[PDB]
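@here heads up, posting the sequence + SMILES for the TPY run so it's all in one place. Ping me if the SMILES looks off, I pulled it from an old spreadsheet.
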Amino acid sequence: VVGGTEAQRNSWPSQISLQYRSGSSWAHTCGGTLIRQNWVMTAAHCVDRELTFRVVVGEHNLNQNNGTEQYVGVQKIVVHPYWNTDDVAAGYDIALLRLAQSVTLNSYVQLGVLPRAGTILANNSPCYITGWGLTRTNGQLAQTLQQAYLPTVDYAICSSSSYWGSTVKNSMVCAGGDGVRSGCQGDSGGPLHCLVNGQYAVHGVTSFVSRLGCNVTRKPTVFTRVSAYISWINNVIASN
Ligand SMILES: *C(=O)[C@@H](CC)[C@@H](CNS(=O)(=O)c1ccc([N+](=O)[O-])cc1)C(=O)O
Ligand SMILES: [Ca+2]
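bot reply: prediction finished. Complex structure tokens:
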């Protein structure tokens, strides 16, 4: 997250860290949202590489023991069947991870609330992106979980020529684009939390930023619109 602030430890209990085995250790690669005690929602592009993955729930500082983490392997990966790694702009950037063990819920570990199917937010709706992604374009991951206020940019504006044009689809949510705050590499897969009727709900799965940089004016961070995939998500969890 560029232009973020450190999140309080219990603000976003559904945020997870998706990591891959790196020799003797594990490295953060993407965020995710815990949606069942044994299921995580993340971006399909986060699991394009054939790596060994684990999920960390109750994480706050990637480089220190927080005394709250639970570590679980990934037992199954279900990517949306229409995902294509060479066309992120086509959409379908979503995947569900079945965990090897069910995690235990507490103030640091909770299920993310998902919007009702079809819900579309009005332009400029209040949302926060969270994650450990780079803190600057071409920078380094954050140590502590970061959050940034990114108001939505509706489809008509976001798909306009000076913003993202045809690259943005109605199955995506755009948020931010102020040139200061944004998602960045490593935030992909995590949640976009938006306040609707007094409750934060995960409306987006972080998907992409401009190739020009993370925080680019009129290139808001782009997320898979969760409310477009409620049936798909329920079908996968019921069939697995
Ligand atoms: C996500 O982090 C976005 C920026 C919000 C970037 C791409 N995702 S990534 O850099 O985390 C990533 C993760 C995993 C793979 N892979 O497994 O192939 C690839 C990229 C972005 O849009 O640059
Ligand atoms: Ca930690």
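MO: Residues 59-62, 64-66, 69 surround calcium ion (ligand 2) (CB under 6 Å).
MO: One more: The CA atoms of residues 13 and 108 lie 5 Å apart.
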